[PDB]
Amino acid sequence: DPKYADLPGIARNEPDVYETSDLPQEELTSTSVEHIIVNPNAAYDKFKDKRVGTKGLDFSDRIGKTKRTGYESGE
Amino acid sequence: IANQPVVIDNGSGVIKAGFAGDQIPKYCFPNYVGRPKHVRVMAGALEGDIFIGPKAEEHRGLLSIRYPMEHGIVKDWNDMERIWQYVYSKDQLQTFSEEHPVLLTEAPLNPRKNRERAAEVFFETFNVPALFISMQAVLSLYATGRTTGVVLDSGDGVTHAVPIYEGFAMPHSIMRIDIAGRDVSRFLRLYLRKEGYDFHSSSEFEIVKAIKERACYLSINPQKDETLETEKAQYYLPDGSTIEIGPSRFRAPELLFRPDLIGEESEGIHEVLVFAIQKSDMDLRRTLFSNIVLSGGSTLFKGFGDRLLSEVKKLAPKDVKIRISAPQERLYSTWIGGSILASLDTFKKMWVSKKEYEEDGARSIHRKTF
Amino acid sequence: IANQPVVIDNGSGVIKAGFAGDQIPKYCFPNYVGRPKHVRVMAGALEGDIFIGPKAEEHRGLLSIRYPMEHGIVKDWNDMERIWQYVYSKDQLQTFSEEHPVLLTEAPLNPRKNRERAAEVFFETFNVPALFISMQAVLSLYATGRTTGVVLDSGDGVTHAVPIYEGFAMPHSIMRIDIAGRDVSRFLRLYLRKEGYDFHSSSEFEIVKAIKERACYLSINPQKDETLETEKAQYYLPDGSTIEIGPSRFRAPELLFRPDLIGEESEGIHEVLVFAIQKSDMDLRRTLFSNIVLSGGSTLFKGFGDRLLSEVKKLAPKDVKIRISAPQERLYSTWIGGSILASLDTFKKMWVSKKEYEEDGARSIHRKTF
Amino acid sequence: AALVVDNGSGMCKAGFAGDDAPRAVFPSIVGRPRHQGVMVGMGQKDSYVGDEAQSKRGILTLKYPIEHGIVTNWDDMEKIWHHTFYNELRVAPEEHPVLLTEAPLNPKANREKMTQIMFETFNTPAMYVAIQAVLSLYASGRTTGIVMDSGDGVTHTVPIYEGYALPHAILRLDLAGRDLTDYLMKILTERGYSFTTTAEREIVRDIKEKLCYVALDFEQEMATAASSSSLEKSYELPDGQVITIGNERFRCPEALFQPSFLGMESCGIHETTFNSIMKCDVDIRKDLYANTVLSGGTTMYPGIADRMQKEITALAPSTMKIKIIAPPERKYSVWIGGSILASLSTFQQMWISKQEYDESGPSIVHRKCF
């Protein structure tokens, strides 16, 4: 504004930002899906107490005693 | 460490994150590595040149977005490290590796080099005290509560069926295919070029994904619905501009069962699952039939599962009842299963200490893992 | 030098200058080379020809004025030198090149030769120890505060419409037109000649340019108002001669958008801007519609922005919100941003020292230019 | 016997079945003057076909319906075709079947539009359209080979193994010499050779064919050429202007080797072809290494085969020997390949007649494509 005052060639009456007056899932809805929550804390506390024993569950290209099984020990 | 374990839903195309004590991942985002395709001289643009989150989620037409997990297998690990640092950053966790137990995800029969490289990061650069990374199938098992079943975990760019009864592995029956929805989106831009739409950018590929996740489904009849007259649904661009569709929206994921269109041999992963069924035990099969595990966001199509039910009817014998196990938020389902697994206290033997990595590393990875 | 930097409001038709801290270029005057209308061989004529300001604003039917920079192409190098010395004199600068830092501003489509030759004069005849060459769109953005934007300028013949988001140097986004009010007024006086009004001398045409800047507008219904019978309001010259204008008051400027009868079938920068839109991407385009900046002096017209608004409204599709920022001091916006850039500390390192120019020269110009 | 009509992206070529020299060697470009207030010049055409447009190139607006081969206004080229008949052979299209050209990844609507023009408009007794690369390999005399086809509007490497469809590796690429000419006139503009219209483009594309070659070590050759002042060769143009080109000659084709110059978000031509190579069986790709079929008239360049060869050779294993197939007549081998292709026994049965089209509509284009 003071610059506009001090500058003679600068005219006025200008709506500066000239603009355009602009004015302003289904898979679950199938005949066969059953999307169910496991109730994370419920199933978690359930399987949580179920201890799991392991004893060197080792398998990668390991030769000796052909059959192997993960979580070897018991708990 | 006695801290909250970092639960990362590291999917090939959708890599989310969070913690165990939280039943919702708070740091969800897909796979993306953007590098500015434009020079910047005048001040006003922020830098880092590897943008994750907002910058990448706003300036799509400026950053050369990379999807470093090539079929879930990344070789530009450096970028992933920076994304993990972004996770350690203020926007996601403000924590350290040493400060928390960590949990990432895995795919079956990956190249050992990737696992080794990842362990190098998390135990050399990052220095997690106790950590273990495993299959997404177990996460889904927690998401279902089931223990018996053929985990059909088919994400963004990987499709795999994991047959496991009562928590007992059967790798010979377990199959894995490193191709999925990402390629159907690739095929979608192939449709674009079929009708002349040179939207080659990764951002343009995201627009393609927006249509994929916006106007696409599965018509259960192949030629009976393909050879008909299409209405050519006018999709609205990131400008809202009209673009028709054609039969494209439903005939695009057909390639997943006839890979010959892309010049590939396969059967349609469900048939590979039927092969796994054949690899299993006769009456124990029926259970797995009823164990219709649904995983990977690529499964989101109207009539998708029903088309696969039709596939079952075309290939499975009578009365071998199948039972759809749908997840609500399939992507979070995996993460929440990981939250359950990470929240397991007994994880002692299940994790891998940092000193263990210092003892053997690779040998101890592949040793302790399957 | 550690002094007040000379902030210059450069230009092919209007070149002004001032300093940092000043809110206005202290001495506002246009670009012109004022030579006499007579043979200055005989003594007692308008020799020297260094007629800037009151000297040019003194003799009217005695001066045949010239114009050096023609669409960013300056050829009257020595005439520019004497105009510089006029500025360097105590009427405009009151100091020297050695005594104060100098800032140079440019636009695209400028050959390196102009930059090199001007830098030769500025570092050899004049000797700026702290000199930098820059753009003008950057300065207009500085004045508007924005960094993201479709910056446009309306100079004497300087018209670049480059969409620049966050100060990103995007040379492939360059869409520069080298024409404005200059030739517009030239064929507007041709219309005057069509109705009997000859203006062949420079000053004789400078009065016509004063009309261009005074009694000329944009009738938003160009062919409708053209088909409508005009009334031809009478203009009064410094001589006071009655001159009706009428349709021609808006014909030649509306002819910019509709170059139909020019021969030089130009565009009307909205078309060029749509081409720049195509260069950008819909995600960025949607934002940049709202991010449009105007500059220069030819923007000054009655119904200017609104006519161009109507133009793009006829161009842009639905649900496309466009906003075109355009203050009142579009000329000074460059100078304002020059003072802003002068206030930048990076700019101190951005400038090329005199010694640095002596070391490389042209390579230093085009390397340290940005 | 038939009508072997080639549709060059730049110029044109045509003739009957079995003709050796292309008859319609003229610019496949459209042009019209500035239809303004002036009257006609003793009565003349409206549209200017090729050489007519080439003749009075100073005003005739050199345009193209062609968008890297994609014809927008089919009326243009069809009138050109009518006149092309009645220009070269003066034969009606109804007595001889026609033969046309195409490029992969083309929207079928283009070819169907073309087809209906030939039947509804031209009433051809039979018709056919095929890929130019097929004619190139036809002229070579092979069936197994990676036909790197390169028109001056588009580029598409065509890997073939005993005349078999391998479109997954075949990739269209809108790489035009016109694009290089765009960048070329742009860099000329900053070299003082500031020119704008398409007439300038015609002259400089001929100059591109005159001295624009392919170097071997672009940066090293660039530095030496910067030092080799004699290499900056001159040529006094048709107008009084002269030129200066030492870098420019090879500086411009590096955009093909580096999309960075244009920001094409692609790969360089050599590794782009290698990417297309990577989509196949590496052991049959061995044959393709031997089948280095360099085709397309836009490959007539000095020092291009060794450049490309060396690049992919650096990408290839030592045993994987590159064996260039590139006759200098490959430009004509397109039309001549079609001309001698018309003389094929099976091809005299392989046709699309009037009732064959009419009674099938545009649907017949799909199976009658190749």
Ligand SMILES: Nc1ncnc2c1ncn2[C@@H]1O[C@H](COP(=O)(O)OP(=O)(O)OP(=O)(O)O)[C@@H](O)[C@H]1O
């Ligand atoms: N001596 C030369 N030097 C450089 N380039 C050349 C030379 N001779 C020909 N060319 C290239 O050949 C191109 C024209 O050949 P081309 O056969 O590709 O034309 P076209 O119209 O694309 O034909 P079609 O569309 O049928 O392939 C020009 O772009 C030019 O770059």
Ligand SMILES: Nc1ncnc2c1ncn2[C@@H]1O[C@H](COP(=O)(O)OP(=O)(O)O)[C@@H](O)[C@H]1O
């Ligand atoms: N509606 C949809 N249609 C097709 N694909 C989808 C849809 N929604 C998500 N996807 C795909 O599935 C992916 C998410 O599945 P996810 O299991 O996270 O993949 P990954 O584990 O490989 O990241 C997304 O990256 C997306 O490509």
Ligand SMILES: Nc1ncnc2c1ncn2[C@@H]1O[C@H](COP(=O)(O)OP(=O)(O)O)[C@@H](O)[C@H]1O
């Ligand atoms: N009211 C007006 N109407 C038309 N043109 C104008 C008006 N005011 C200024 N101009 C034009 O704009 C020019 C000033 O803009 P500027 O950006 O300084 O031009 P340049 O950069 O070419 O000197 C003047 O030379 C004149 O041609």
